[PDB]
Amino acid sequence: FQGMLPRDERRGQLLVVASDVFVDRGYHAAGMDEIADRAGVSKPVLYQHFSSKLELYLAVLHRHVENLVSGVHQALSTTTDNRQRLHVAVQAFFDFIEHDSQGYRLIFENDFVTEPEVAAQVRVATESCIDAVFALISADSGLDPHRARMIAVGLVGMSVDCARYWLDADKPISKSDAVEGTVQFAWGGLSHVPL
Amino acid sequence: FQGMLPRDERRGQLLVVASDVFVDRGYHAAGMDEIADRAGVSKPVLYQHFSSKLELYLAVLHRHVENLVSGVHQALSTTTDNRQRLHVAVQAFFDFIEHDSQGYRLIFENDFVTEPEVAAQVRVATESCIDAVFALISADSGLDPHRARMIAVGLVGMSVDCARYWLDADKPISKSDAVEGTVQFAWGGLSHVPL
Ligand SMILES: [Cl-]
Ligand SMILES: [Cl-]
Ligand SMILES: [Cl-]
Ligand SMILES: [Cl-]
């Protein structure tokens, strides 16, 4: 099947450059001329790969979303020892936001409100993570769907909030401490906070 | 002291009417003429109490914020048995969002972005709840300030997220079940979800 054929190496390089420009300028100020300039490709070659600035922006957003979502899903498939996969998944999330700073900004601090499809892509990806957690909670607990879904939302939201606090506070503790603190709270709740 | 003198009964009635109009119309479409009309007061009497539509909007927002924030603080002073005050506080929050629907919309679904002071009033009130939780976690645990603050953000955020999910899903379970589910997850974490 053609979906297994080698990835377009030039496409990947163009997305990295486009991500730099979109994050630096914002969507409206960013231009295909600057992206072509910085990619070292002619503007017609850039247009052969991406017929519009919007298609390129959505491709950049998707590359960052897929990086995070695949990392979270892969974490959840490592083990069915829930305490352990909770750490692998929270770790994957902190690893993403620390490593892929442009991705963090594009997903969690998106200001391109003029295009509803951008906010929708963020919601559908967020819902993919909540759905993955909901599927595990439903399967591994006696909670009925309504209760499992509320806890899945609480768990994902609590995780996002701890991480955003840590990153927005300029990393006041190590990433390993921030991940472990978030995991211990998610697993044991207030009842297991050190006394 | 003059701060203990009786409340202005007409002021309170005007705020209830103003809240109806602001929620129904949005800030920009709302007018002092409609508020005066519905309050059964003359427009000069309305202006004797509130010199501008913005002052009236901020007074409406504050009345709703104070309702929630005082309810949360009072819940936290009822008992130092943390498992119990966690329920009293989460209950106070669900009671507010269910009873004070206009307050829920004005605080959690605010669309008046043209006035930065509106978003700031919501943030400073949110921070008052996080600060109250942080003060308890710091005092009742061995967590240092950075770790206590991250957990306080996670706890408040998780609570807001469970409640917003419940309300946005048209209350698929009873408020008592939604409160208890949120409290049990906050207290015991994933480790104590029914098996
Ligand atoms: Cl490709
Ligand atoms: Cl960046
Ligand atoms: Cl008064
Ligand atoms: Cl309402």
Residue numbers in the entry:
A (entry chain A), B (entry chain A): 31 to 225
Give sentences copied directly from the paper behind this entry.
FasRΔ33 readily crystallised in the absence of added ligands and also in complex with acyl C20-CoA (arachinoyl- or arachidoyl-CoA). The FasRΔ33-C20-CoA dimer is strictly symmetric, with the crystallographic twofold axis relating one protomer to the other. A striking feature of FasRΔ33-C20-CoA is a tunnel-like cavity, delimited by helices α4, α5, α7 and α8, with its two openings towards the bottom and the top of the EBD. C20-CoA binds within this tunnel, in a parallel orientation with respect to core helices α4, α5 and α7. The tunnel is ~28 Å long, with a predominance of hydrophobic residues on its wall pointing their side chains towards the lumen of the tunnel. Towards the cavity’s upper entrance, most of the 4′-phosphopantetheine portion of the CoA cofactor is also observed, the sulfur atom (due to its stronger electron density) was instrumental in positioning the whole C20-CoA moiety. Electron density becomes less clear towards the tip of the pantoic group, likely due to high mobility of the CoA portion, eventually vanishing in the region corresponding to the 3′-phosphoadenosine diphosphate group, which were thus not included in the final model. In FasRΔ33-C20-CoA, the dimer is opened up, with both protomers separating away from each other, compared with FasRΔ33-C14. Using the position of conserved Tyr77 Cα as a reference (at the centre of helix α3, key to mediate DNA-binding), the two HTH domains in FasRΔ33-C14 are ~48 Å apart, vs ~57 Å in FasRΔ33-C20-CoA. Taking the above observations together, we hypothesize that binding of a ligand, long enough to fill up the entire hydrophobic tunnel, stabilises the FasR dimer in a more rigid configuration, fixing an open HTH geometry that is incompatible to bind DNA. A fully extended C20 acyl chain measures 26.5 Å, within the FasR-C20-CoA tunnel the acyl shows some bending reducing that length to ~20 Å. The latter magnitude is enough for the C20 chain to fully occupy the tunnel, its distal tip located immediately beside the bottom opening that leads to the space between protomers in the dimer.
